[PDB]
């Protein structure tokens, strides 16, 4: 297993910021050999945008992931299927995601769609939950890529995201290969949310 702790800042309408503390861990599914990486950082830049042609609730994502501080499956563009099932304070909803993943430049292009109507939480609060095996590792660090070395069997991603002064998401994710497309199947349970706090009140400015 490996661990990462980070805090995402979300801008609010009233100028203030909403903080999202992340506890993340990853566990290989396969019973085989994996790499135990030293401390290293993942530097993520990430932009969100809209398809103007899409009438459904959606989020376009462009992301560049790069490390600083059993892999051949990624030598090129891998397809991605993402499926999230969540309920937040009893709100049942699903997000479906398609796109490509090029590990060679640490770039992800994915478009996500709310399958069940209106998304009951702001899309930014679901970004860090909605495939870090695509992050580009330099060659002096090619040995510290846990994610790739757990493939195609995959790994389990488990993360609790608590929003200060508000509720918390608890997600479970299976990130594996499924017939030469990479899949992220995720459950998400949010509890104890203020029914008109930043999240359920939809008070987050939309970018990140």
């Amino acid at each position: 297993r490996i661990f990462a702790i980070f805090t995402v800042r979300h801008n609010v309408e009233d100028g203030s910021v909403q903080l999202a503390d992340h506890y993340q861990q990853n566990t290989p599914i396969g019973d085989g050999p994996v790499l135990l990486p030293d401390n290293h950082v993942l530097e993520t830049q990430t932009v969100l945008s809209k398809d103007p042609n899409e009438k459904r609730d959606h989020m376009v994502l462009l992301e560049f992931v790069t490390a600083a501080g059993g892999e051949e499956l990624f030598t090129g563009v891998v397809p991605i299927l993402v499926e999230l099932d969540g309920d937040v304070n009893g709100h049942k909803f699903s997000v479906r995601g398609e796109g490509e993943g090029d590990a060679t430049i640490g770039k992800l292009t994915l478009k996500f769609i709310c399958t069940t109507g209106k998304l009951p939480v702001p899309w930014p609060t679901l970004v860090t939950t909605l495939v870090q095996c695509f992050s580009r590792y330099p060659d002096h660090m090619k040995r510290h890529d846990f994610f790739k070395s757990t493939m195609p069997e995959g790994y389990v991603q488990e993360r609790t995201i608590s929003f200060r002064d508000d509720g918390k998401y608890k997600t479970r994710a299976v990130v594996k290969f499924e017939g030469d497309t990479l899949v992220n199947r995720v459950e998400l349970k949010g509890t104890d949310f203020k029914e008109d706090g930043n999240i359920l009140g939809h008070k987050l400015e939309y970018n990140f």
Binding site: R1, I2, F3, A4, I5, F6, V8, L36, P37, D38, N39, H40, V41, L42, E43, T44, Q45, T46, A68, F146
Partner: peptide, 9 residues
């Protein structure tokens, strides 16, 4: 922009 520190069990 964000950087993320990954540990080890």
């Amino acid at each position: 922009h964000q950087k993320l520190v990954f540990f080890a069990e």
